Amino acid sequence: DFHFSAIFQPTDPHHHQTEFAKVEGSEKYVEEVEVFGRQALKVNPEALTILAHRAFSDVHHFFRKDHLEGWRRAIEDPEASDNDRYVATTLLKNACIAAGRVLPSCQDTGTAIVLGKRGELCWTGGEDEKYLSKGIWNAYRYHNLRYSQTAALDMFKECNTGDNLPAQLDLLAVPGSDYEFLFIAKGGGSANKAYLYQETKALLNPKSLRAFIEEKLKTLGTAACPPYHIALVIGGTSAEMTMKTVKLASCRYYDSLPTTGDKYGRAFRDPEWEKIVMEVAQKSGIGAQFGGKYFAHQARVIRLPRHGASCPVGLAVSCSADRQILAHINKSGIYIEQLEQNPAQYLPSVKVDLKRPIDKVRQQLSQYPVGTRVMLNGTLIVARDIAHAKIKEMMDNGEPLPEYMKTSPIYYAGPAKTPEGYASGSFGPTTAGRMDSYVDLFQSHGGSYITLAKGNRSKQVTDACKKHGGFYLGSIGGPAAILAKDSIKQVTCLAFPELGMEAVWKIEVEDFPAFIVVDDKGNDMYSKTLA
Amino acid sequence: DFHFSAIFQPTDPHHHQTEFAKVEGSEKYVEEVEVFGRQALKVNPEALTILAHRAFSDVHHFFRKDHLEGWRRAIEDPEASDNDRYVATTLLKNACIAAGRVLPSCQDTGTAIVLGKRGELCWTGGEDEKYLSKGIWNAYRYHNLRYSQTAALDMFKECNTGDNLPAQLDLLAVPGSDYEFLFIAKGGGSANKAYLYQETKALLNPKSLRAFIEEKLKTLGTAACPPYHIALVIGGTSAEMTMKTVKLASCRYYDSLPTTGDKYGRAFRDPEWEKIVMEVAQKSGIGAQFGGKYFAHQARVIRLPRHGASCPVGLAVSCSADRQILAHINKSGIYIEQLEQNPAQYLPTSVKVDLKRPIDKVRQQLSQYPVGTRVMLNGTLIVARDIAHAKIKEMMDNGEPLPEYMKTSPIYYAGPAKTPEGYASGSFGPTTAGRMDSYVDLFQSHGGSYITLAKGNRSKQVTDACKKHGGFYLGSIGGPAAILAKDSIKQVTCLAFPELGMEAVWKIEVEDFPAFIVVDDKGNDMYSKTLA
Ligand code: SF4
Numbered sequence A: 001d002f003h004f005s006a007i008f009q010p011t012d013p014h015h016h017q018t019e020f021a022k023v024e025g026s027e028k029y030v031e032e033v034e035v036f037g038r039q040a041l042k043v044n045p046e047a048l049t050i051l052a053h054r055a056f057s058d059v060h061h062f063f064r065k066d067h068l069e070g071w072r073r074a075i076e077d078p079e080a081s082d083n084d085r086y087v088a089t090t091l092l093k094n095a096c097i098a099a100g101r102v103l104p105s106c107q108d109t110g111t112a113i114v115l116g117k118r119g120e121l122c123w124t125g126g127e128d129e130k131y132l133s134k135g136i137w138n139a140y141r142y143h144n145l146r147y148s149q150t151a152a153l154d155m156f157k158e159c160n161t162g163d164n165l166p167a168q169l170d171l172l173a174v175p176g177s178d179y180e181f182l183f184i185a186k187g188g189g190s191a192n193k194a195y196l197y198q199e200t201k202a203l204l205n206p207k208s209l210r211a212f213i214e215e216k217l218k219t220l221g222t223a224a225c226p227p228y229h230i231a232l233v234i235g236g237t238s239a240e241m242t243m244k245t246v247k248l249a250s251c252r253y254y255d256s257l258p259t260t261g262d263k264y265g266r267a268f269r270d271p272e273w274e275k276i277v278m279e280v281a282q283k284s285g286i287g288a289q290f291g292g293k294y295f296a297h298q299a300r301v302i303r304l305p306r307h308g309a310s311c312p313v314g315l316a317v318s319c320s321a322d323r324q325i326l327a328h329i330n331k332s333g334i335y336i337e338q339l340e341q342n343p344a345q346y347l348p349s350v351k352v353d354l355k356r357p358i359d360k361v362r363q364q365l366s367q368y369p370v371g372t373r374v375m376l377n378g379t380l381i382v383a384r385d386i387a388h389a390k391i392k393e394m395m396d397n398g399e400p401l402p403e404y405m406k407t408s409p410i411y412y413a414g415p416a417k418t419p420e421g422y423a424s425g426s427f428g429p430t431t432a433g434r435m436d437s438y439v440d441l442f443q444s445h446g447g448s449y450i451t452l453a454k455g456n457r458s459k460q461v462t463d464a465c466k467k468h469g470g471f472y473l474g475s476i477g478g479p480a481a482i483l484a485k486d487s488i489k490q491v492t493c494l495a496f497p498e499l500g501m502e503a504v505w506k507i508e509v510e511d512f513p514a515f516i517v518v519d520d521k522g523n524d525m526y527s528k529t530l531a
Numbered sequence B: 001d002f003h004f005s006a007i008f009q010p011t012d013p014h015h016h017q018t019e020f021a022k023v024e025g026s027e028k029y030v031e032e033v034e035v036f037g038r039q040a041l042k043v044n045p046e047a048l049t050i051l052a053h054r055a056f057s058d059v060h061h062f063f064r065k066d067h068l069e070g071w072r073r074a075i076e077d078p079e080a081s082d083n084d085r086y087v088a089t090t091l092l093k094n095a096c097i098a099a100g101r102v103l104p105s106c107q108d109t110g111t112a113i114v115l116g117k118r119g120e121l122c123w124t125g126g127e128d129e130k131y132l133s134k135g136i137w138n139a140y141r142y143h144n145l146r147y148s149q150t151a152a153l154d155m156f157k158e159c160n161t162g163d164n165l166p167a168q169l170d171l172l173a174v175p176g177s178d179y180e181f182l183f184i185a186k187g188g189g190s191a192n193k194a195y196l197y198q199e200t201k202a203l204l205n206p207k208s209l210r211a212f213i214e215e216k217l218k219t220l221g222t223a224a225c226p227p228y229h230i231a232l233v234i235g236g237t238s239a240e241m242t243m244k245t246v247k248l249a250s251c252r253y254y255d256s257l258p259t260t261g262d263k264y265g266r267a268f269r270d271p272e273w274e275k276i277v278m279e280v281a282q283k284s285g286i287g288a289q290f291g292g293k294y295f296a297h298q299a300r301v302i303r304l305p306r307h308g309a310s311c312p313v314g315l316a317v318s319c320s321a322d323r324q325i326l327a328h329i330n331k332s333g334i335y336i337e338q339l340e341q342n343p344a345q346y347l348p349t350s351v352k353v354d355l356k357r358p359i360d361k362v363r364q365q366l367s368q369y370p371v372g373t374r375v376m377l378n379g380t381l382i383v384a385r386d387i388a389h390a391k392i393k394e395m396m397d398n399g400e401p402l403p404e405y406m407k408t409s410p411i412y413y414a415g416p417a418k419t420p421e422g423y424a425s426g427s428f429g430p431t432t433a434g435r436m437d438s439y440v441d442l443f444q445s446h447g448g449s450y451i452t453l454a455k456g457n458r459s460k461q462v463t464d465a466c467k468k469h470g471g472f473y474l475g476s477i478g479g480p481a482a483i484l485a486k487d488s489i490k491q492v493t494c495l496a497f498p499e500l501g502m503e504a505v506w507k508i509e510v511e512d513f514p515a516f517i518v519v520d521d522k523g524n525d526m527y528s529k530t531l532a
């Protein structure tokens, strides 16, 4: 009466649908042998270093076809808004710059994640984590990427690790003699838009599920640089299993799952509800960051088994920096997913002078409604999470708001490393919402009247800007390389150099595009679509 | 300049601090060999079946010493409330019944979870998942446990799998030639109290973190049968990694981690903030289910590295059905964590309510007493939980009346485990009340569900409903499923929806069934102060 049924039963478990290139000469790192009557594979662990290094290098300069096609679709669709087409065009041009292999597509070169599946008879010597980490260390050290990992010395005292380690290394034991991988360079912004809900049987009917989807998609907002790959997971054997599944779904790792369930409780993709998610996304009007039809590229919906008392639900996105690479090691050597090296084939405002007293800039901005596209020229002061926290602490000790918070618009950003001979490394915005708790306080103390970042912000910021005569400008989110190449002319570290990328910077920009998102009158260009 | 630093650096990676027993003769399942100059271990996969079968049998009848010590502490502490002592005593007595090996400690015998760590040179033949699942299948089929897993035939159509499969099988590739395990039989109620928050650097200061902890602990409420083992994880490399870590922390799997961080970003336990979690838990007044000091057994707090832009936070509990077992396979055979077989050594006023009356007379008697009053129920309960409620609501939406059997007796939210031979009932404790909250006003407006019996605090809509309709919510003690079955439940019959499993509608006769009046017919709620 016993019948074993794996939860996940992909029809393409080895991802034959993906194109791979072999690393030249890599057959020298492997040797097929036969032990106690079974086929095995000896793998020199140096292969793991070589592979991780190449994967976490390549992935910052190239994209998958389903990602690129999405941007082309947003540009060619008659039903797309002007803002849809503008954002999609900008991201594709950004991808073209990144394919030059010098600037990464986003300044946030992400957390390094490895899903590895080592066969029972795949023998590495066992030091996989160290050799994988060395390859990751190599990728981030010798390329123009960014060190984004923050170590906790105690509960509150932190420092940058200075090398983008530690990685997330999930190494699984599986049948056979090969070694298979999914590498993810996961941006913090989209990592933050991974949500867990604890629901019940009361959710599990068409009317309730539909309303739930409408509600939760809005809470994604524009803060992770849409168009999104949206993943939804209904059910799961535990919260952590539900969240792992929604991550992998967003990476299209589970695309070959069955599309029907059975009495043994197997997982399945649900194309019907994928279509419903896409309809909700399109009809939301949220669009590709600034209103329109292209809130989402595509959707993945996986239904999982559940304990009778439980219904975990996971929602997550892959952002404009859509970065994953499949790979495997076998008797012929090292194979790595081939990304699109020619993104160009997918390609078919008010001037604001910052070189004035900031009150003059505020005055000019006040003349325009939210939704107005502006082009910024001049000085930006750059500060994000830790600098804001330090500055609040200083003021709490009676010290003044620093002068540099009062002279210029505040750009929330952290740069990637500067290539030799370049003015700037990749240098796009980080998410505005994380700084919301500082705005009223800083404005009340005569600073941060104008901020520049991406994403919708909370009502406290709208109220602050109305009370103090302030403004929030939304940069396009994602196009870090073209911004660095065309707009950023000079970069200087101003304060807190120990914070690395999170130091305060002073930069000079030309033709820097943005939208007026919040004005000085109580208006918010997201108030209709993200209410 | 490259330095490798594992995120997790336990000082006791093989859990030498845990006591293990050897499965007799099990060295016959393993053989030491050497290939290419390296030591390897051949393991007959039947060992995985044997091990999983024993783990998922044992864990339902015995507990760890640190769990039992917590209950004793709740009894002997002068600062424990009278209700703390009463609840802890009941749970300890329940444990004594469970140790007889016939009745499981909770009716919710849980999801079967396996964390396995297979050495590079540990060779099983590779069919680990099947052989582990067969052992799990054995444990739930041949013992008086419960089939709790719900398969989705399509997005909305569901059926019970009938065998408590599928399991969650997380098999990791690690160095060496052994096979190490953590088995968890995870109740749905405590699984539901695993929460992910997406926070920021603005959280990371003493004042903000303290206020945050105060706020979130209350949202745990009493719906997962406290005293809790509370785990809190600050940071993490991804949401799923944060949630995995908070699960393992709640199982005390990470107890031997370092207690300081470093510039390489290693994980650490934080004893100071563990103490603060316990102070918040104690000062909350929430108590062991019904007011007092013993909201929590103990706390685990793990600080993790984070992306500069991110701060995932995980909060989770282990409930009164605290069920995990460590194990390992090596050249000497199969070893399994030894649990406490004699819980009795840890062991150091109510209104009688006759339910065999018209329900309107019962409502009248209940109306005489304030919330917090202890009652003893005698007579008939109609049993129905999540799926039965959904089916009945569906019927009413199609114009059918509320069935008569929903009007004649109090409604007990529960799903029983299988009945042992010669027993009146298998383990049969309460289900979380909050999950049925959306049905109460509707059912009461149609003349039924005036009196409900389950566990956990409920939402304001239920308080309002009971005041509008002259209703009551009674809180059973959460957890003591075995002693309820042995002492209180006298007869069980299936009344409706036989196609459902443990989730059919049942009619049961009970005696001396203890409960508290949690919500009355006047707008009062005994949790309104502590869970506000
Ligand atoms: S594309 Fe946007 S959300 Fe994604 S990593 Fe870059 S800044 Fe963050």
Ligand code: SF4
Binding pocket: B106, B107, B108, B186, B187, B188, B189, B190, B223, B224, B225, B319, B320, B321, B429, B430, B431, B478, B479
């Ligand atoms: S002890 Fe309570 S929360 Fe835990 S499984 Fe049993 S009923 Fe659910």
